[PDB]
Design an enzyme around this catalytic site. Structure first.
Site, PDB file in Angstrom:
ATOM      1  N   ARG A  38     -14.355   1.111   1.499  1.00 15.89           N
ATOM      2  CA  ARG A  38     -14.881   2.340   0.872  1.00 15.89           C
ATOM      3  C   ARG A  38     -16.391   2.321   0.767  1.00 15.89           C
ATOM      4  O   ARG A  38     -17.045   3.360   0.916  1.00 15.89           O
ATOM      5  CB  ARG A  38     -14.280   2.584  -0.512  1.00 15.89           C
ATOM      6  CG  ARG A  38     -12.842   3.081  -0.497  1.00 15.89           C
ATOM      7  CD  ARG A  38     -12.258   2.950  -1.893  1.00 15.89           C
ATOM      8  NE  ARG A  38     -10.797   3.064  -1.959  1.00 15.89           N
ATOM      9  CZ  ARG A  38     -10.100   3.975  -2.637  1.00 15.89           C
ATOM     10  NH1 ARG A  38     -10.680   4.959  -3.303  1.00 15.89           N
ATOM     11  NH2 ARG A  38      -8.766   3.930  -2.602  1.00 15.89           N
ATOM     12  N   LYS A 215      10.224  10.418  -1.721  1.00 16.10           N
ATOM     13  CA  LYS A 215      10.853  11.493  -2.508  1.00 16.10           C
ATOM     14  C   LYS A 215      10.764  12.873  -1.834  1.00 16.10           C
ATOM     15  O   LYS A 215       9.773  13.172  -1.194  1.00 16.10           O
ATOM     16  CB  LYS A 215      10.207  11.571  -3.888  1.00 16.10           C
ATOM     17  CG  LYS A 215      10.515  10.372  -4.779  1.00 16.10           C
ATOM     18  CD  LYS A 215       9.533  10.258  -5.938  1.00 16.10           C
ATOM     19  CE  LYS A 215       9.909   9.114  -6.872  1.00 16.10           C
ATOM     20  NZ  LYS A 215       8.720   8.611  -7.633  1.00 16.10           N
ATOM     21  N   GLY A 373      -3.763   7.673   1.400  1.00 14.22           N
ATOM     22  CA  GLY A 373      -2.652   6.960   0.745  1.00 14.22           C
ATOM     23  C   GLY A 373      -1.877   6.134   1.762  1.00 14.22           C
ATOM     24  O   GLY A 373      -2.484   5.482   2.585  1.00 14.22           O
ATOM     25  N   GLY A 396      -3.949  11.900  -2.693  1.00 16.13           N
ATOM     26  CA  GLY A 396      -3.596  13.075  -3.491  1.00 16.13           C
ATOM     27  C   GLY A 396      -4.310  14.348  -3.016  1.00 16.13           C
ATOM     28  O   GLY A 396      -3.727  15.422  -2.922  1.00 16.13           O
TER      29      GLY A 396
HETATM   30  N1  LIG Z   1      13.884   4.828   3.896  1.00 14.00           N
HETATM   31  C1  LIG Z   1      13.125   4.577   2.815  1.00 14.00           C
HETATM   32  N2  LIG Z   1      13.645   4.186   1.628  1.00 14.00           N
HETATM   33  C2  LIG Z   1      12.862   3.944   0.561  1.00 14.00           C
HETATM   34  N3  LIG Z   1      11.510   4.038   0.602  1.00 14.00           N
HETATM   35  C3  LIG Z   1      10.887   4.423   1.751  1.00 14.00           C
HETATM   36  C4  LIG Z   1      11.676   4.720   2.932  1.00 14.00           C
HETATM   37  N4  LIG Z   1      10.829   5.065   3.927  1.00 14.00           N
HETATM   38  C5  LIG Z   1       9.582   5.016   3.417  1.00 14.00           C
HETATM   39  N5  LIG Z   1       9.628   4.625   2.137  1.00 14.00           N
HETATM   40  C6  LIG Z   1       8.482   4.435   1.236  1.00 14.00           C
HETATM   41  O1  LIG Z   1       7.695   5.606   1.204  1.00 14.00           O
HETATM   42  C7  LIG Z   1       6.529   5.179   0.476  1.00 14.00           C
HETATM   43  C8  LIG Z   1       5.381   6.059   0.897  1.00 14.00           C
HETATM   44  O2  LIG Z   1       5.743   7.392   0.581  1.00 14.00           O
HETATM   45  P1  LIG Z   1       4.629   8.361  -0.048  1.00 14.00           P
HETATM   46  O3  LIG Z   1       4.083   7.684  -1.262  1.00 14.00           O
HETATM   47  O4  LIG Z   1       5.270   9.731  -0.175  1.00 14.00           O
HETATM   48  O5  LIG Z   1       3.568   8.293   1.156  1.00 14.00           O
HETATM   49  P2  LIG Z   1       2.059   8.852   1.146  1.00 14.00           P
HETATM   50  O6  LIG Z   1       1.215   7.971   0.232  1.00 14.00           O
HETATM   51  O7  LIG Z   1       1.748   8.674   2.596  1.00 14.00           O
HETATM   52  O8  LIG Z   1       2.193  10.290   0.728  1.00 14.00           O
HETATM   53  C9  LIG Z   1       6.302   3.706   0.779  1.00 14.00           C
HETATM   54  O9  LIG Z   1       6.275   2.944  -0.431  1.00 14.00           O
HETATM   55  C10 LIG Z   1       7.503   3.349   1.643  1.00 14.00           C
HETATM   56  O10 LIG Z   1       7.991   2.029   1.406  1.00 14.00           O
HETATM   57 MG   LIG Z   2       0.011   9.372   3.265  1.00 15.38          MG
END
Ligand SMILES: Nc1ncnc2c1ncn2[C@@H]1O[C@H](COP(=O)(O)OP(=O)(O)O)[C@@H](O)[C@H]1O
Ligand SMILES: [Mg+2]
Ligand SMILES: [Mg+2]
Length: 416
Positions: A38, A215, A373, A396
């Site tokens: 960063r 989610k 993220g 975010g």
């Molecule tokens: N099939 C799965 N089951 C549970 N967790 C998952 C699965 N596939 C991806 N993940 C989890 O999704 C998380 C990232 O999702 P998210 O926080 O929505 O991503 P971002 O930060 O890119 O928006 C990671 O911690 C990863 O381990």
């Molecule tokens: Mg992301």
């Protein structure tokens, strides 16, 4: 629109004091910086100002979660001043506050080319507008004190630069409260504005969204808005099991399931059909007996189902082929969310294979945009930050842009 914001390259800084909001929220292990990326990322903006004859560059940032109490033993920016000096090759004066008479005097008319780093903005409740007292109870800032804090920051430069996209989604004092005539995005910000303008205003086509992660319910507006912009959408990661249980009656074991998201799966598929969006869901999986790095692993398909007790933690090889087909068709890609549990090597193959494909796509001219993220963490982990078009610096904030929102920090920038 995102297009028409003032940026640093268009700002005359010769003879001017520059007050610059930067993202120095670096990871720490007991006051030592574990990753300085960063800090490096802000150097181009800083050097530009110095090279074009700025009288001073005053840097303001936050670090950690002080929640509006001074915590200099835990979350001081002092170690960043040392690292910045090494990266810039110039002396950096560190001040132990960010507002008040002593800071204002130091910043009023410094020696030409002075670089000043202020202490953590979030030691003051007035930055976020709220915080937590020593009992852990919510405190609200007082308007007169917010005004004073903003007025103090505004004294420290003649022109303002915001190079902290990762906070631009928040109406914090350092994002929206600096009262100067010209407010410009720095060079990091400019890249965010430009690339997300492609994602939101004028995409190359066919335009593919790759939406993964864990989610569904927190990604409804993201999916909804992307369905108004794209030609194709991959739905992967943990989200996929909600879609597959609803649409195929798949047995999903202990895989993530979103009971609220389930009730809108058919609504999203319907909107996709209405807009001509081709949806690609996974067809096969790497399974695990438990949510653990060293779990026993298996395999499953949509047709086989996943055994009771077991969870799908990555897509399988046939899914990777279908995903690669979509990437091959695309002239622009936005990717938010890994398609498996990338943190753990046994469940990273799907995300790594897909990254490989996105890199190859970039090589033949695909515009490839990674959200901040966890998807950005993937690029850092496999050294592909330089091999895709854009890796966003704000998780975010990138998500809120992609939802269709106006970011208060972006809206505060000067027009034209
Ligand atoms: N099939 C799965 N089951 C549970 N967790 C998952 C699965 N596939 C991806 N993940 C989890 O999704 C998380 C990232 O999702 P998210 O926080 O929505 O991503 P971002 O930060 O890119 O928006 C990671 O911690 C990863 O381990
Ligand atoms: Mg992301
Ligand atoms: Mg003011």
């Amino acid at each position: 629109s995102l297009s028409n914001k003032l940026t640093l390259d268009k700002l005359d800084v010769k003879g001017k004091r520059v007050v610059m909001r930067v993202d120095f929220n670096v990871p720490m292990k007991n006051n030592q910086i574990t990753n300085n990326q960063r800090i490096k990322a802000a150097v181009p903006s800083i050097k530009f100002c110095l090279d074009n004859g700025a009288k001073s560059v005053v840097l303001m940032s936050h670090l950690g979660r002080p929640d509006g109490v001074p915590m200099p033993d835990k979350y001081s920016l002092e170690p960043v001043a040392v690292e910045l000096k090494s990266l810039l090759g110039k002396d950096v004066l560190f001040l132990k506050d960010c507002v008040g008479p002593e800071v204002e005097k130091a910043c009023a008319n410094p020696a030409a080319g002075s670089v000043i780093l202020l202490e953590n903005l979030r030691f003051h409740v007035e930055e976020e507008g709220k915080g937590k007292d020593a009992s852990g109870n919510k405190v609200k800032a007082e308007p007169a004190k917010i005004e004073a804090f903003r007025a103090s920051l505004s004294k420290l430069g003649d022109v303002y630069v915001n190079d902290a996209f990762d906070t631009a989604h928040r109406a914090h004092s350092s994002m929206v409260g600096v009262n100067l005539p010209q407010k410009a995005g720095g060079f990091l910000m400019k890249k965010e504005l430009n690339y997300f303008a492609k994602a939101l205003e004028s995409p190359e086509r066919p335009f593919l969204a790759i939406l993964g992660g864990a989610k569904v319910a927190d990604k409804i507006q993201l999916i909804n808005n992307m369905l108004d912009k794209v030609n194709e959408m991959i739905i992967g990661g943990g989200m996929a099991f909600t879609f597959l249980k609803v649409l195929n009656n798949m047995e999903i074991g202990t895989s993530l399931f979103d009971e609220e998201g389930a009730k809108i799966v058919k609504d999203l598929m319907s909107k996709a059909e209405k807009n001509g969006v081709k949806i690609t869901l996974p067809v096969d999986f790497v399974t695990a007996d438990k949510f653990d790095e060293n779990a026993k692993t298996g395999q499953a398909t949509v047709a086989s189902g996943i055994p009771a007790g077991w969870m799908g933690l990555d897509c399988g090889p046939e899914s990777s082929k279908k995903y690669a087909e979509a990437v091959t068709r695309a002239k622009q890609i936005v990717w938010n969310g890994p398609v498996g549990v990338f943190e753990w090597e046994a469940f990273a193959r799907g995300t790594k294979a897909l990254m490989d494909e996105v890199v190859k796509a970039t090589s033949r001219g695909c515009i490839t945009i990674i959200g901040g993220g966890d998807t950005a963490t993937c690029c850092a982990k496999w050294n592909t930050e330089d091999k895709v078009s854009h890796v966003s610096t704000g998780g975010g904030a990138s998500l809120e842009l992609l939802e269709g929102k106006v970011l208060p920090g972006v809206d505060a920038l000067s027009n034209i």
